[PDB]
Amino acid sequence: GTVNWSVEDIVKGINSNNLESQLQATQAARKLLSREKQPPIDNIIRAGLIPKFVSFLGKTDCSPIQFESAWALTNIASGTSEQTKAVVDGGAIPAFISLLASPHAHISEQAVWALGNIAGDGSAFRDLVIKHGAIDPLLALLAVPDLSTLACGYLRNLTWTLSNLCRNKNPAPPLDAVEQILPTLVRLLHHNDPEVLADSCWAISYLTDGPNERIEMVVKKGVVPQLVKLLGATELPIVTPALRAIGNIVTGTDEQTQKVIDAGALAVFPSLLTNPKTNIQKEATWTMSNITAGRQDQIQQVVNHGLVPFLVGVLSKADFKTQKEAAWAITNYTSGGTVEQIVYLVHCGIIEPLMNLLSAKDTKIIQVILDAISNIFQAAEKLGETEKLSIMIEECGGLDKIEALQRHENESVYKASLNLIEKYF
């Protein structure tokens, strides 16, 4: 019937002034564009079919052709930036926004999907979709007493499109649009569907990936406790975005970081810092590094939750990126911590893994480790116990690594190693 048509046949059908022939040709185009391997998007564009599909989007009298053209244009817009641009240049944004209010649920869903692709292209098309007024009808589709009444796929597509409206920086989404979307996003963040939860967490992670004012916009809605609960979830697709969001939040002020701590986040990090998925370990160690850069009371809460031994463990054995994040965490700890907190860090066994990491090739991690060692030595100076620490480093074999780094190509490593050896060895 409409299977395995040539683009020539599709064009002949769509060029006929018979709406039923046009519908069948558009369905053939949809089926061609829905094939697993290499859909002929470029051939369809070159045939000049995008304007015809956009015109069909407005055939209120023929809902099937609306649906077929919406599907075809969705799949064209799923391709390269040039193909999405081809869809946009045909005038598809306002037509899809108009279809958002269609009485046919499948057509409205297809329009949601298409606008999601368009906005997902980048910040320019995102903001253009916003300027055409998509947020109001999109959110109206979700203004129901109980989200569970909506079809699962429909709700998932709406959540994903909203997440794409929150995505990308340079520039970040308009502030008024973020404020308009956030309430519905919190409501979705309390939904029970794993995919909806994952995409809501991804949206929140986008919104928190910026200055402290954006983070404040998010945290003032009260989402941090729910984010921590989701941090404790079993599904990795949920934990990953939740963890990214929590990390973004703790990159902000001390008060926002304290909101993360007050919600019980630290209690989850024994598992996160031992998670078998390397990316979770890296992201959790980076989050810990930003928490240890906080106040001394926040460092103390890190201590009380027994997380210093887990940092020692990650420093001792882990993927090198995770070990680098752990070195950052240790240096921040030693920079902001009290003498008591620093000696506790040493008592947990940080020196040996920290010295073993000086064998790496990355210069910046070497500089970070040397700064942490300098801070620990200052702490030991205020206690007059520098010789015990020097003996601990020498027995470990770290003095050899430092006197070797004296000959490092980088100037900062050279000077820091020489300062350490001149002042304490």
Binding site: S81, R167, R244, W286, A293, G336
Partner: peptide
């Protein structure tokens, strides 16, 4: 001790094809 923000995402376009 300064806070370190996340590294840039390398996935610059998020789109979905309907099969």
């Amino acid at each position: 001790a300064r806070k370190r923000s996340a590294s840039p995402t390398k996935k610059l376009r998020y789109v979905k094809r309907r099969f």
